[PDB]
Amino acid sequence: IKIRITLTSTKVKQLENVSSNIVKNAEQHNLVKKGPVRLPTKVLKISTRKTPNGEGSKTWETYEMRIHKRYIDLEAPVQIVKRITQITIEPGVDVEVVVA
Amino acid sequence: ENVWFSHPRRYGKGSRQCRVCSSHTGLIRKYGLNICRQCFREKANDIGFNKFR
Amino acid sequence: RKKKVYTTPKKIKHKHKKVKLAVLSYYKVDAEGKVTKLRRECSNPTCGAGVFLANHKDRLYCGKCHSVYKVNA
Amino acid sequence: LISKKRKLVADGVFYAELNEFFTRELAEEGYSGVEVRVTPTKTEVIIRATRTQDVLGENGRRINELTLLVQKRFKYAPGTIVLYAERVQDRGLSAVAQAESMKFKLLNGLA
Amino acid sequence: MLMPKEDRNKIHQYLFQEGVVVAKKDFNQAKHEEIDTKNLYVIKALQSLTSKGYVKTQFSWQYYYYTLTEEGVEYLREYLNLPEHIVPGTYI
RNA sequence: GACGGAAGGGCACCACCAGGAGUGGAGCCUGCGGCUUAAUUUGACUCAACACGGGGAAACUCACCAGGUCCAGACACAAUAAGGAUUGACAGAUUGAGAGCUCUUUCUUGAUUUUGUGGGUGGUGGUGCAUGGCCGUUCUUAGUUGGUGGAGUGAUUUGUCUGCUUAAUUGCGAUAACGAACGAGACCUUAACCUACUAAAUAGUGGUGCUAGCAUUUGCUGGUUAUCCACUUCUUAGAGGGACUAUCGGUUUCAAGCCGAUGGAAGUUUGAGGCAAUAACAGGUCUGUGAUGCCCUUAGACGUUCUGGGCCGCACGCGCGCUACACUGACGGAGCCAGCGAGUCUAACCUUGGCCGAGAGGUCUUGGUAAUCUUGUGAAACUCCGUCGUGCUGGGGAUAGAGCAUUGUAAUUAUUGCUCUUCAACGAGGAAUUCCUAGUAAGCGCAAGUCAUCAGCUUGCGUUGAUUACGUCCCUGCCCUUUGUACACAC
């Protein structure tokens, strides 16, 4: 009943195939929807000195994390959303569903 | 006695400690990961913090 | 450090190691009859008359209540 | 509830904590690797290990203790956290397992 | 040490009920969850139990994980005088 | 092999050549040396220490200096030892101390218990002239090593090299070498082209009713969110395709290559990075840790803590730095810009609002787990009109004082932000030295890091944006070859 399924993972291929198979399931089961809305890749930059001590040249490195976010809105029945939650589940992608 | 720890530690590096080696100095607090910098260097390879640039 | 004389006086003040004294706590002697009570105890409702009242000098103090007790019995 | 960035950073730090625990104690039980399966109200964690029959314990007691530790730590209902143990072919494809093997060999006293 | 038998038995009964004791290496706080006794007393008692040899210790980022032993659970059981197969900490 | 004030060849704006910005000179925030007491805790001292220990520290961080407890001998035994230990309790003398650790004394759960016998725990006590790991450096150059074969008695040598190009033992090629490996290159992220393929009530493009204004006459701005549509031309993910010197002209046993004309996106690998071979330094690191070999405390300990301080102390010398030494100005009023990035669940961040005010200050939820909100981040120099005009002066902002409040229960050796003030050195700085070939030197700023409070620092991003260079081995460095050597911890 007016729910939103979003995916906030960092495994890009798992996210891609999850979105693909979810789209295929929705189209083959004839549920009208708009395409997966895709958010800008959020980059987390954390800069750290290499040396544990204070010595050496003032060298630096930047550890980076990437985040890809997708979301789709579903208006689908209770039994079918139970089916979608319990099946077509693919690990590696942190997928959560809220309402409105 | 009840005055063993009277002096507060609600701010400063008295509170902030590393979650791996209990470091107080060099504690990078960002994103709420609460580990020291060298521990972050060591554990980035295994956690999934990967160097590209 | 390795060069320290600690000019403050020697303070070897190890507490008493329970010097073995004689027996104590004589209330009263009532031979061949009903036994009475002495050494006035606490009357606090939570106590069951087990608190040795702090009869120091014209002043008492309770044991069950660890913080506040102002009486003069 | 809380922010997704902090959420996945805690995911990483919990992964690091569990990997450190496993490599600290399950090492002599031939521990090689772990992967976390996230499911609604379920946390499946997989372990491909070399000495599976001796890491298992007599009737799953050690696996029960590993489970119920994190269960009581994060107030999980029993069964919600579940860890599975398998054995992978070609045990030489495990740098950590070989590391712990010759690590024990040194404390044994081999050349 | 001088540490109450009440919370000594409290720690022992938690040991029996769960089979593992979690203790963050955060002493000098004296406020454990669900227990009003000193957490440093709790940790010292559990560590003494380990030294006398009935429970194994792990640090794991200063978190004092503990785990009962084949003889440790038996010793606690025999102290508590519980019927056979009543409620072991590693049951399922 | 090393070195040569030995030769040849090939390279480098951590080198120069023509320059630009500079610093060194002034003030003032930072670190080191020296000076000081009880201390001003230590690491390191050319590149490769000196805004570096992510060290922007008020009372932990605090490793140092004054004072104040328990001793945690975890684990068993010899001796007091329920005719009862052991810590622990209310008051004046003592101590900031309402911590009996003691002086006039009255005890509630209580055999873990006092010395030693053995052994343990902690340590930001050392040792990096014991380590691991992480670095930095050798080394931003291209070098390194087997198998087999050849050479020499042997250490070893060839392979791994004449000549040409490249950034490159990159290759062409010659050839007692053939066959392999690593490094390099390949490799991956970032930025630059598509008006094309799948997708955007977290926004618009294009049409109407609510529309209001300029206005009446035929155009522009926006809001009206179950108020009706096609798409992404502006915020985006992807087999995505594409620069491989593509085509052509010149030089080269015209082989590899180099210099020129261009639609095409760039024709110096299209740029900027990560990772980066073999060997080594006695280079940093025991101050990142319940990591250690060897010495230190084992009980008036260096073991965890409390109140004050201290690392900010200043006669002096140095090191990135910010503002400067005025007219391209200083100040005053009007017109507008994006990006890296962060932001509150068992706690309270970023703060959108009405208001009381010169400013800084003071309220309840509406906004936000974050393409929706903070944030068109309306930022800074920047464009138009204005005052002053060469006086150390309206330039320069600092050394003094007076005030107003969020921080911290605690500012004080101004923490901080505003108003008045002060008007100090400084008139572009000697010898001497740092960055630089494109959106880059530089000038302006913004977000994050350490944030209770505090950036003049760092990590990145964005705006405005230049003449300079297409060469060299002259100074300083790198590699290779030849060569000399009485060097070999190696000039």
Swiss-Prot record, chain A:
GO CC list: cytoplasm; cytosol; cytosolic small ribosomal subunit
UniProt keyword list: Acetylation, Cytoplasm, Isopeptide bond, Ribonucleoprotein, Ribosomal protein, Ubl conjugation
GO molecular function annotations of the record: mRNA binding; structural constituent of ribosome
Keyword Ribosomal protein part of the UniProt annotation: yes
Subcellular localization: Cytoplasm
Covalent crosslink: Glycyl lysine isopeptide (Lys-Gly) (interchain with G-Cter in ubiquitin): K2, K13, K82
PTM comment: N-terminally acetylated by acetyltransferase NatA. Also partially acetylated by NatC.
Primary localization class, coarse: cytoplasm
Function summary: Component of the ribosome, a large ribonucleoprotein complex responsible for the synthesis of proteins in the cell. The small ribosomal subunit (SSU) binds messenger RNAs (mRNAs) and translates the encoded message by selecting cognate aminoacyl-transfer RNA (tRNA) molecules. The large subunit (LSU) contains the ribosomal catalytic site termed the peptidyl transferase center (PTC), which catalyzes the formation of peptide bonds, thereby polymerizing the amino acids delivered by tRNAs into a polypeptide chain.
Protein family per UniProt: Belongs to the universal ribosomal protein uS10 family.
Subunit structure, interactors included: Component of the small ribosomal subunit (SSU). Mature yeast ribosomes consist of a small (40S) and a large (60S) subunit. The 40S small subunit contains 1 molecule of ribosomal RNA (18S rRNA) and 33 different proteins (encoded by 57 genes). The large 60S subunit contains 3 rRNA molecules (25S, 5.8S and 5S rRNA) and 46 different proteins (encoded by 81 genes).
Swiss-Prot record, chain B:
Predominant location category: cytoplasm
A GO cellular component annotation in the UniProt record: cytosolic small ribosomal subunit
Binding site for Zn(2+): C18, C21, C36, C39
Cofactor note: Binds 1 zinc ion per subunit.
Location in or out of the cell: Cytoplasm
Cofactor(s) the protein needs: Zn(2+)
Keyword Zinc listed: yes
Family, per entry: Belongs to the universal ribosomal protein uS14 family.
Additional remark text: Present with 6490 molecules/cell in log phase SD medium.
General function of this protein: Component of the ribosome, a large ribonucleoprotein complex responsible for the synthesis of proteins in the cell. The small ribosomal subunit (SSU) binds messenger RNAs (mRNAs) and translates the encoded message by selecting cognate aminoacyl-transfer RNA (tRNA) molecules. The large subunit (LSU) contains the ribosomal catalytic site termed the peptidyl transferase center (PTC), which catalyzes the formation of peptide bonds, thereby polymerizing the amino acids delivered by tRNAs into a polypeptide chain.
Protein name: Small ribosomal subunit protein uS14A
Species whose genome carries this gene: Saccharomyces cerevisiae (strain ATCC 204508 / S288c)
From Swiss-Prot, chain C:
Organism: Saccharomyces cerevisiae (strain ATCC 204508 / S288c)
Glycyl lysine isopeptide (Lys-Gly) (interchain with G-Cter in ubiquitin) cross-link, renumbered residues: K28, K34
Function: Component of the ribosome, a large ribonucleoprotein complex responsible for the synthesis of proteins in the cell. The small ribosomal subunit (SSU) binds messenger RNAs (mRNAs) and translates the encoded message by selecting cognate aminoacyl-transfer RNA (tRNA) molecules. The large subunit (LSU) contains the ribosomal catalytic site termed the peptidyl transferase center (PTC), which catalyzes the formation of peptide bonds, thereby polymerizing the amino acids delivered by tRNAs into a polypeptide chain.
Parent-protein residues present: 80 to 152 of 152
Source organism, top-level taxon: Eukaryota
Modified residues (Phosphoserine): S43
Subunit structure: Component of the small ribosomal subunit (SSU). Mature yeast ribosomes consist of a small (40S) and a large (60S) subunit. The 40S small subunit contains 1 molecule of ribosomal RNA (18S rRNA) and 33 different proteins (encoded by 57 genes). The large 60S subunit contains 3 rRNA molecules (25S, 5.8S and 5S rRNA) and 46 different proteins (encoded by 81 genes).
C4-type ZnF: 42-65
Compartmental location: Cytoplasm
Record's protein name: Small ribosomal subunit protein eS31
Curated annotation (Swiss-Prot), chain E:
Subcellular location: Cytoplasm
Post-translational modification note: The N-terminus is not modified.
Main location as per UniProt: cytoplasm
Membrane spanning residue stretches: none
Superkingdom of the source species: Eukaryota
SUPFAM superfamilies: Winged helix' DNA-binding domain
Gene3D superfamilies: Winged helix-like DNA-binding domain superfamily/Winged helix DNA-binding domain
Single GO MF descriptor: structural constituent of ribosome
A cellular component annotation (GO) from this entry: cytosolic small ribosomal subunit
A GO BP entry: cytoplasmic translation
Keywords of the record: Cytoplasm, Ribonucleoprotein, Ribosomal protein
Protein function: Component of the ribosome, a large ribonucleoprotein complex responsible for the synthesis of proteins in the cell. The small ribosomal subunit (SSU) binds messenger RNAs (mRNAs) and translates the encoded message by selecting cognate aminoacyl-transfer RNA (tRNA) molecules. The large subunit (LSU) contains the ribosomal catalytic site termed the peptidyl transferase center (PTC), which catalyzes the formation of peptide bonds, thereby polymerizing the amino acids delivered by tRNAs into a polypeptide chain.
Family in the record: Belongs to the eukaryotic ribosomal protein eS10 family.
More details: Present with 54100 molecules/cell in log phase SD medium. There are 2 genes for eS10 in yeast.
Name listed for the protein in its UniProt record: Small ribosomal subunit protein eS10A
Organism of this sequence: Saccharomyces cerevisiae (strain ATCC 204508 / S288c) (Baker's yeast)
Phylogenetic classification of the source organism: Eukaryota, Fungi, Dikarya, Ascomycota, Saccharomycotina
Originating gene: RPS10A
